[model samples]
Structure formats: structure tokens, C-alpha cells
Target chain A: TYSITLRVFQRNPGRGFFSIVEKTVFHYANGGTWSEAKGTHTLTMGGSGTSGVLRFMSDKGELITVAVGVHNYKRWCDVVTGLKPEETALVINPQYYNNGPRAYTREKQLAEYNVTSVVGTRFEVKYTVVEGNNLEANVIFS
Target chain B: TYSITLRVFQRNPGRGFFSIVEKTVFHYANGGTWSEAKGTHTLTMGGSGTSGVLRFMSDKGELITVAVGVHNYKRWCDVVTGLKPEETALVINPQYYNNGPRAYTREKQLAEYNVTSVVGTRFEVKYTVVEGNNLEANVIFS
Candidate 1:
């Protein structure tokens, strides 16, 4: 059995034009199964926060997604993947700030894998911003 | 003129499911007068790479946008603003991952700003991803 930990940090807690804050987290296993609300935190705006996940996976880990920001005004996310032994890969890092009522957003993606070894653990990750798009992941090694 | 440095690092230089890599950068001056294509770098799909932008802005800078990924398949972006002294604000961080191509995209936008002080600078940013859209922004300073 193998274990993995996913940690996320929010830099500037609050002090924005808005008053509400929202945060969400997700975990994906082997690019297929998903778990939502694995870890999430919410504040009234003005306090910094952090969240994480530690669990055993039946297979190699795939991805971890995190979104933090002032609801209805601004939000940012970190799509993390490609975390092997000594290597770190960033899937996507997008930010959005609105001076208006409508919302503005963009996304990008990339992929590469070398499971040459059917042994060691592998970690890859990515994120999406659509509502209801949530997940949690873990693999069981026996 | 104050200066800001934007640095971007790509972990898996290539090896996405696709071959073409795309990159884009945007710089907004106090919510208006944008300087697009300030910095960009492209590479084939098996290495590591980094890109950065260091320059003086007409005013206290406001927003920065960066996108990197395999073209056609998917791409992600980083939109940022509220760059106060020692303080960083993130707006959007989205990622797209697709092994095939069919071209499914959507984007939303919002805006508003107030730069009451004639000295310091304030910035507001937004984005739209659906297509057939563009913009310019501004804030009132006394």
C-alpha cells in the first residue's frame, strides 16, 4: 500500500472588493475515478486558510485541484500534477478578477507519462472550474 | 515608472498528447492601455523551459495573463491582478486536458474598480473564453 498527501495554500486571505469567500478541493485517481469535497474551507473574507489530503491509493495518484477566492468577485486555482519522486509538474495556474458583474475565465492543459515501471508510485493532476465538477482520489496497492 | 517581473515555468517541456505547444502573455496598465504579447515562448512536445517579463509600466501595473499547453487539444491560463507591495492577488487558474480534439470552450467576464488615490495604482481584470469577445478597462483616480 502507498500513501499521498495533497496540500494547498491561499496567499492573501482577503481584503478584496467583495465580502464572501469560497474554496473547493478535489482528488482524481488514475485519470478516471474522482472524489468531491475531499477538503474545502470557507471564510467571511479577511482570513487566510489551508487544506490538505492524506490517504492510501489502490493505484498511482493522478491529480489534485484547488480553488480559493472571494465569491462573485475574484477566484484563482492551482491544478497540480506530475509529482513523482524528485520531479514537480504544474498542470494549470489560472486567475480571474472581475470589475464587472459577468465572469471571465480561461483554461489550458498538457499531458505526458512514462509508466515505464509498473512498480513505483506516479502522481499527475489537473483542474476544471465548472460548477459541480468535484472529486477525491486514492488507489489501493496490495 | 514602476517595474514588475512576471515569471512562468513549464515543468514537462513537452510530451503532451499533442505536438504543438502554445504560450501567451498580457500586461494591463492600471486597468487600461493593455500591452499584449509582452512575453511568450514556444517549444516542441520533451524538456523543461521558463519565460519571464521584466519591464516598466506606464503606471503601477494592474493585471497579467499567461497560457501554456498543447495547442488544439487543450490549454490553461493564469490571470492575475491586485499587485500591491508584497501582496499578490490571483483571479483565475483553470486547466483543460483532452486526448482528442473537438473544440469545446466557454468563457465568462466581470469588472469594476476604484483608484481614489492619484498616486498609487489600482487594477481590475476580467476574461471571456467562449469566443467573439474583447475588452479594455479603466479606474477613476482623484
Candidate 2:
């Protein structure tokens, strides 16, 4: 139908750190199913006030916003839901790293992006603490 | 390509108290890659140790071990990579039930077959611990 892009940021109305990479894309069905056509949807950060947009196309050829929010560096949604190999939504809360611990291992992409305290597709995450200029994104979702 | 069943159980190998059901089907590759034709597969289980089977065809039709397993009520995976999607090799210990609370939700096939857990084609899940179960199976991949 169409594509949707969710623009997210940290500030309440909209402003904070942002993302450079895009998240997952959804293929809205003409009837009632969301599918994935082509793309390796992933997340990346460092937007001064842009959380990034989650863009996807719909069967009817319209664009919509599926999700949006602000996040901090190292803070990410380690847990995800709506996964079906081809389609799904995910929540990411950023995490922090220790420079003293040879940050390489702490910054392990796949593994570090794997810890989840909870699960869901929708969320309102906030930065609870900023240690050494690092922001921690915490969220509660249903 | 052919069809076969492989079943295994985990008595709290690492994460906690849990069991697994594995069913693998054979697939012949068209060339060096995999085949489009899929064989039969199923994973059987029960609390009383009684067994049952759930059959399905693979998407790519690769000869991968189609095993599934069950876990104690109210438990979840910390990461998706802890084991292969179909491989229910336990990663946590059983006594960790001490770390969390216990609550059971009644399920018919589970009650009738004594299945404490289930491994559906797209999702493998435990019935208890309301949040993790639903999030992992329904919302995680939206």
C-alpha cells in the first residue's frame, strides 16, 4: 500500500540525540498482513536530535509512521519482538561501555545488542542517567 | 531428501529448568546450495515424559536439524543466539527459578499431552510468565 517513516528524537516535543541508520521496514498488505520484501533493516546512532525514521512501503502506495522516540548512545533496545524471519518490530534501549575494560569487547555489536530486560513492539524510552557523557535509555513496553 | 524425528530434553543445563523437542527433516540441495523440496519434521514432548509431534515444512528446504524443546514455566531467553532457533540446547541452570517467581497458565494441548513448553514453526515458547511468553511469540516479530 505505502511506506512509513517514523522520525524520533529525545526532547519531549522532539529533539535530542539522533540516529544515522534506519530501522526495519514494513510491507503493509492490501488486505490485513504486513510483510517484508527486501532489505536488512538495522539500527545505528549519533543523531544530535534525530532518532531516525523507520521507513516501509504499504500495498496501497502510502507512507506512514510506525514508531518514533529518543535514545542515548550505548543505550539501545537489546530485546525485540514481532520477529518472523521476514517481518517484525523491535525495541532497543541503549547500553553503556567501560573504557577501562578495553571497550572492544563491550562494544561487541551482535552480542551487546542481545540483552533484553523486557520485550514488546511499542515503547516510550527515556534517558535515566548519563555517565561519562553516556546516556542510558530505559523503557517499559506492552 | 527424507523425513525423521529427533527429540532431546534439558534438565536445566544452564538457563534454568527446561526441556526440548527436536524434529529434523532432510532436504537435498539443487546444487551446492539447498533444495526447494522439504522433508517431514516434528518435535514431541510432555511433562509426564509422554511424547507428541508437530510437523511443518521448511521455508528454504535445507537439511537443517528441525529440533524443538520445552522449558519450565516463566522462563525466557537472554539472547536469540544462545542456541539455534530450532535447537533448544539449554544455556542456563534450573535452580535459577530462585531468581524469579513462578506462575502457570493452563493450556489444553499442554495439559492433555503434558507439554510444559511448545516449539511452533515460527516461535518456540513457554506458556507461563505472561510477559515474556506473549512478547516473544506474538509481539517480538511484529
Candidate 3:
């Protein structure tokens, strides 16, 4: 079976005062619709921000996007700000599409954990695929 | 290719306070060790309470767990309280192992998103497996 690891590290510290605390939650978001037009799927965050969008623009491409929530709280939102990759930030599969269908049907979606972290926390995610190949989006996130 | 959908939904409504807005962050957690003894992986949250824990007991098993953060703050941590699955609360693969190596190896870890959501939001996560099929735990969360 095929396997992959997704890790999340907090690059900032949190401030806790009395009953109020400010922190961030790294989570999966409600992504864009699987489109035949672009032959791809997309996930984006931020209106006040632009740097925080993940796009699997190619027909047979994959992506790994991260979303943050406001603490006082962290859930999932559409208008998230300031969550980016480190140096090699382009975490999404940066390669172009290969052969096969220009668009991917909703094959399947998977998830495994929910890590509770403070800034400077590193959490890893893992999953096992049942069988088969031909995944246009073999995307891995950290 | 193996495909599964991990859905994350916000069941509560966040307060729209001042700069000190309160919110929650839902994420993946760093689960228990792969013990040759228990032959399972356990993911849990809460010591003050026993409600948040995902355990994949039995050999050759797998699990799916979710975590939360404090937003105004959210991140991964060792000690977290108050995060439980809904009605069918047992989001983890509750069944015992069938057969295989009593313990699972750190075969591979994986992750893919960072969703930004307001309260009462629903997010879905999906992924593809390259090959193979021997997972005792095929846990799905919503």
C-alpha cells in the first residue's frame, strides 16, 4: 500500500492572559469544487490576504493547503490570513499534470487526526491507501 | 487508488467579540506510540475529562483522530481538554483487530489541509493512496 506523512509545525508563539488567549488552529478547509473547466480542484483562504491560497490548477494535479482559525478559537474558515509555507513553501505538488483525464472525479477524501499544538509544536498525520494507482493528486502536506 | 472522505464540521457558533474574538481551531493530533504490546495506535485529548481520545487498539490497526486549538489560539499540545466526537461519537475504528502483526509499524504519516472556517462550518478532506491494502484501521471522521 502507498503511504504519506503530513506534518504541521507552529512557527509563532501564543500569548495567554487571564481568560483570553490568542492562538491558531491548522486544519483542512472546505475546498473548491472539482472543476472540469480547469480540470482541477482549488482551496483558498483570505480576502484581505492573497498569499494563502492552494490551487491544484493542472488537470491531473494535487495540492496540500492549510487553514487557520481565530482563537479565542480555531475551527475552519474561508477568510484566514497569514498561514504560509516556509522556504520551500510551495508545498502543493508543484509539478504539471501528466496524461489521463483532464479532470478528476471525486474519487475519495481522507483524514486521520486533529493535533492540538502551541506555537513551535510539530504534529504528523498518516493514512494507508487501500489499493490501486493512477492518482493524479498524490499530494502530501506538512 | 484508495480514497476516503474526512469531514470536519463546526457545531458551535463563535462569538463576535472585539479584538479579543473567541474561536476554536480543529486539527490533527500527534497520536499514541505504535506499541508492539497494545498492537494499536491511540489518539486522545483531555485529562481533566476522558472524552477526547482516539485509540486504534489491536494489532495491524489504524485510527482517525481530530484535535483543537485555542484561537484567539490554536496549535498542537500534550495536554488538551474538551474535544469530543458527535453522537456516533466513536469516530475511531472501534472494532478489534482481525489478524496480522500484533503491532503496527510507523509505516507512513500523512496530512493535507488547513481549513479556515467560522463556527457551524463543515469541511471535507480527501486523499488518494498509491498502492497496497493491509490497514486494520480505516477510521473516518465528520
Candidate 2 chain A: 10-residue stretch with minimal lDDT: A9-18
DockQ measured for candidate 2: 0.01
Each prediction's TM-score versus the true structure:
0.19, 0.23, 0.17
The sequence of per-residue lDDT tens digits that candidate 2 reaches over residues B35-88 is: 211111232222211222222222222111112223343222211222345433
Among the numbered candidates, top lDDT falls to 2
Docking class of 1: incorrect
Kindly list the per-residue Cα lDDT of model 2 for residues A1-142, writing each as its tens digit. 1111111221110111112222432121221122222111222233321122343222222222223222222322233333333332322211122233212322432212222222212334333342222333322222
Q: Where is model 2 more than 4 Å wrong at Cα? A: A1-47, A55-122, A128-133, B1-142
User: Could you report the DockQ of all the candidates, in the order they appear?
Assistant: 0.02, 0.01, 0.02
Number of the candidate with higher lDDT, 1 or 2: 2
Task: Assess candidate 1 and give its TM-score to the true structure.
Answer: 0.19
- Candidate 3 is scored at a TM of 0.17
> Candidate 3, after superposition: displacement of residue A10 in Å?
33
lDDT of 3 by residue, A37-92 (tens): 23322222222111121221111121123322111112122211123212011211
Question: Model 1, stretches more than 4 Å misplaced?
Answer: A1-142, B1-61, B73-93, B97-142
The residue-by-residue lDDT of candidate 3 on B56-139, one tens digit each, is: 111111112232111111212111112221201121111111222310211113222333223322222222331222112222
In candidate 1, what are the lDDT values of residues A1-142, reduced to their tens digit?
A: 1111222222222211111011111221110101123452221122222111121112223222222322222222222323331111121212222222112321111211112123333333222232222222222111
What TM-score does chain B get in every candidate? 0.22, 0.18, 0.18
